[PDB]
Design an enzyme around this catalytic site. Structure first.
Site, PDB file in Angstrom:
ATOM      1  N   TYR A  39       0.831  -1.191   0.000  1.00 31.98           N
ATOM      2  CA  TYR A  39       0.000   0.000   0.000  1.00 31.98           C
ATOM      3  C   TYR A  39       0.864   1.238   0.000  1.00 31.98           C
ATOM      4  CZ  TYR A  39       1.136   0.456   5.024  1.00 31.98           C
ATOM      5  OH  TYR A  39       1.814   0.594   6.203  1.00 31.98           O
ATOM      6  N   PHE A  50       1.983   9.529   3.883  1.00 30.57           N
ATOM      7  CA  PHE A  50       2.223   9.391   5.320  1.00 30.57           C
ATOM      8  C   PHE A  50       2.769   8.000   5.695  1.00 30.57           C
ATOM      9  CE2 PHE A  50      -2.337   8.790   4.491  1.00 30.57           C
ATOM     10  CZ  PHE A  50      -2.512   7.468   4.921  1.00 30.57           C
ATOM     11  N   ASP A  51       2.607   7.027   4.790  1.00 33.82           N
ATOM     12  CA  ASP A  51       3.005   5.640   5.091  1.00 33.82           C
ATOM     13  C   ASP A  51       2.949   4.800   3.824  1.00 33.82           C
ATOM     14  OD1 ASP A  51       3.740   3.366   6.667  1.00 33.82           O
ATOM     15  OD2 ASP A  51       1.658   2.968   7.221  1.00 33.82           O
ATOM     16  N   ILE A  70      -7.628   0.265  10.282  1.00 35.53           N
ATOM     17  CA  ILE A  70      -8.729   1.231  10.190  1.00 35.53           C
ATOM     18  C   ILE A  70      -9.924   0.625   9.443  1.00 35.53           C
ATOM     19  CG2 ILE A  70      -7.265   3.262  10.505  1.00 35.53           C
ATOM     20  CD1 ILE A  70      -7.026   3.661   7.561  1.00 35.53           C
ATOM     21  N   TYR A  96      -8.771   7.874  10.646  1.00 30.78           N
ATOM     22  CA  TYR A  96      -8.361   8.226  12.021  1.00 30.78           C
ATOM     23  C   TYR A  96      -9.216   9.328  12.653  1.00 30.78           C
ATOM     24  CZ  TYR A  96      -4.395   5.144  11.180  1.00 30.78           C
ATOM     25  OH  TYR A  96      -3.625   4.050  10.872  1.00 30.78           O
ATOM     26  N   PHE A 113      -5.550   5.596  -0.345  1.00 37.35           N
ATOM     27  CA  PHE A 113      -4.598   4.498  -0.316  1.00 37.35           C
ATOM     28  C   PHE A 113      -4.637   3.759  -1.645  1.00 37.35           C
ATOM     29  CE2 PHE A 113      -5.386   4.738   4.278  1.00 37.35           C
ATOM     30  CZ  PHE A 113      -4.140   4.436   4.840  1.00 37.35           C
TER      31      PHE A 113
HETATM   32  O1  LIG Z   1      -0.556   2.794  14.676  1.00 36.38           O
HETATM   33  C1  LIG Z   1       0.168   2.725  13.709  1.00 36.38           C
HETATM   34  N1  LIG Z   1       0.830   1.582  13.533  1.00 36.38           N
HETATM   35  N2  LIG Z   1       0.499   0.657  14.578  1.00 36.38           N
HETATM   36  C2  LIG Z   1       1.202   0.255  15.672  1.00 36.38           C
HETATM   37  O2  LIG Z   1       2.340   0.562  16.000  1.00 36.38           O
HETATM   38  C3  LIG Z   1       0.446  -0.695  16.557  1.00 36.38           C
HETATM   39  C4  LIG Z   1       0.051   0.053  17.850  1.00 36.38           C
HETATM   40  C5  LIG Z   1      -0.881  -0.801  18.711  1.00 36.38           C
HETATM   41  C6  LIG Z   1      -0.072  -2.030  19.104  1.00 36.38           C
HETATM   42  C7  LIG Z   1       0.414  -2.797  17.852  1.00 36.38           C
HETATM   43  C8  LIG Z   1      -0.792  -3.240  17.005  1.00 36.38           C
HETATM   44  C9  LIG Z   1      -1.667  -2.053  16.597  1.00 36.38           C
HETATM   45  C10 LIG Z   1      -2.074  -1.234  17.839  1.00 36.38           C
HETATM   46  C11 LIG Z   1      -0.786  -1.161  15.740  1.00 36.38           C
HETATM   47  C12 LIG Z   1       1.296  -1.895  16.985  1.00 36.38           C
HETATM   48  C13 LIG Z   1       0.182   3.971  12.865  1.00 36.38           C
HETATM   49  C14 LIG Z   1       0.857   5.113  13.298  1.00 36.38           C
HETATM   50  C15 LIG Z   1       0.816   6.268  12.523  1.00 36.38           C
HETATM   51  N3  LIG Z   1       0.115   6.297  11.373  1.00 36.38           N
HETATM   52  C16 LIG Z   1      -0.559   5.221  10.932  1.00 36.38           C
HETATM   53  C17 LIG Z   1      -0.546   4.040  11.677  1.00 36.38           C
HETATM   54  O1  LIG Z   2      -2.863   2.788  13.161  1.00 34.68           O
HETATM   55  C1  LIG Z   2      -3.392   1.934  13.836  1.00 34.68           C
HETATM   56  N1  LIG Z   2      -3.561   0.739  13.270  1.00 34.68           N
HETATM   57  N2  LIG Z   2      -3.038   0.749  11.936  1.00 34.68           N
HETATM   58  C2  LIG Z   2      -3.666   0.796  10.729  1.00 34.68           C
HETATM   59  O2  LIG Z   2      -4.867   0.788  10.495  1.00 34.68           O
HETATM   60  C3  LIG Z   2      -2.722   0.855   9.561  1.00 34.68           C
HETATM   61  C4  LIG Z   2      -2.784   2.276   8.955  1.00 34.68           C
HETATM   62  C5  LIG Z   2      -1.711   2.458   7.882  1.00 34.68           C
HETATM   63  C6  LIG Z   2      -2.050   1.460   6.783  1.00 34.68           C
HETATM   64  C7  LIG Z   2      -2.069   0.015   7.333  1.00 34.68           C
HETATM   65  C8  LIG Z   2      -0.695  -0.341   7.927  1.00 34.68           C
HETATM   66  C9  LIG Z   2      -0.277   0.642   9.022  1.00 34.68           C
HETATM   67  C10 LIG Z   2      -0.349   2.091   8.500  1.00 34.68           C
HETATM   68  C11 LIG Z   2      -1.318   0.509  10.120  1.00 34.68           C
HETATM   69  C12 LIG Z   2      -3.114  -0.117   8.445  1.00 34.68           C
HETATM   70  C13 LIG Z   2      -3.766   2.391  15.220  1.00 34.68           C
HETATM   71  C14 LIG Z   2      -4.859   3.236  15.417  1.00 34.68           C
HETATM   72  C15 LIG Z   2      -5.157   3.684  16.701  1.00 34.68           C
HETATM   73  N3  LIG Z   2      -4.386   3.327  17.746  1.00 34.68           N
HETATM   74  C16 LIG Z   2      -3.317   2.527  17.593  1.00 34.68           C
HETATM   75  C17 LIG Z   2      -2.981   2.054  16.322  1.00 34.68           C
END
Ligand SMILES: O=C(NNC(=O)[C@]12C[C@H]3C[C@H](C[C@H](C3)C1)C2)c1ccncc1
Ligand SMILES: O=C(NNC(=O)[C@]12C[C@H]3C[C@H](C[C@H](C3)C1)C2)c1ccncc1
Lengths: 122, 122
Positions: A39, A50-51, A70, A96, A113
């Site tokens: 992605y 952003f990613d 998400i 988000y 995406f």
């Molecule tokens: O949250 C993001 N990545 N996710 C993570 O680092 C985690 C954080 C929590 C513990 C584990 C499983 C889930 C929930 C995803 C690792 C993220 C940060 C910034 N932008 C997009 C996604």
């Molecule tokens: O970001 C979180 N989960 N992550 C996600 O939903 C994603 C969002 C981006 C695209 C994919 C791979 C990575 C970065 C994680 C799915 C999150 C949201 C809220 N709190 C903790 C983690």
């Protein structure tokens, strides 16, 4: 000319297939399956990425339909088939939400995406 | 009585082993490996759980050391061995930083995660 498929009734998850996947039951993934994707995620307004798993050169894996991602992602990938490549536009409801996530995702952001479904397994 | 291991020099990633894993090279995971874990994440201040794989009853999988997760997680899991269970305290630097992530994670939040390393593979 490319079809846009509205996967919710509120216009919040709109998928455009850039490359059709393979047909057949064996090629559509099921709830709970581990799905492997590439992605690139960018903000609609600025276009700023952003990613990206492609930048990592590591395919990203998650369990479909279980809230590991998400909500726009669970909805979008549930509609895809093996090898399908799409661009999905997610309203912040399916992203988000009001608060965003980190510097790179402001509150109330529409996310775009590009997602390729590479494979899945149970 | 339980040891606290400071995995960075700034006090930002502090791991307490609640259950020792198995020893031997074959039981420590390597950069890039798919690691399978269970976790529960809560805010230090309130104690409110913001995310749990145990509530999902689905083990969470990621690729170690590739930035697929918050930095505190890459650092913490790199130190773990098969079957190890720990509680790690992450300063917001190693979490979601100044802006937080969604409603459930305010800016400048210390996160406490209980993480169990279940298995890994290449
Ligand atoms: O949250 C993001 N990545 N996710 C993570 O680092 C985690 C954080 C929590 C513990 C584990 C499983 C889930 C929930 C995803 C690792 C993220 C940060 C910034 N932008 C997009 C996604
Ligand atoms: O970001 C979180 N989960 N992550 C996600 O939903 C994603 C969002 C981006 C695209 C994919 C791979 C990575 C970065 C994680 C799915 C999150 C949201 C809220 N709190 C903790 C983690």
């Amino acid at each position: 000319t490319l079809e846009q498929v509205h996967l919710t009734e509120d216009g919040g998850v709109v998928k455009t297939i850039l490359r059709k996947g393979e047909g057949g039951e064996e090629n559509a993934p099921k709830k709970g399956n581990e799905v492997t994707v590439h992605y690139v995620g960018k903000l609609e307004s600025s276009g700023k990425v952003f990613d990206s798993s492609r930048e990592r050169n590591v395919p990203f894996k998650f369990h479909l339909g279980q809230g590991e991602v998400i909500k726009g992602w669970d909805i979008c990938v549930a509609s895809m088939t093996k090898n399908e490549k799409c661009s999905v536009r997610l309203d912040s409801k399916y992203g988000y939400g009001e608060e965003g996530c980190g510097e790179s995702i402001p509150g109330n952001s529409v996310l775009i995406f590009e997602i390729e479904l590479i494979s899945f397994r149970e």
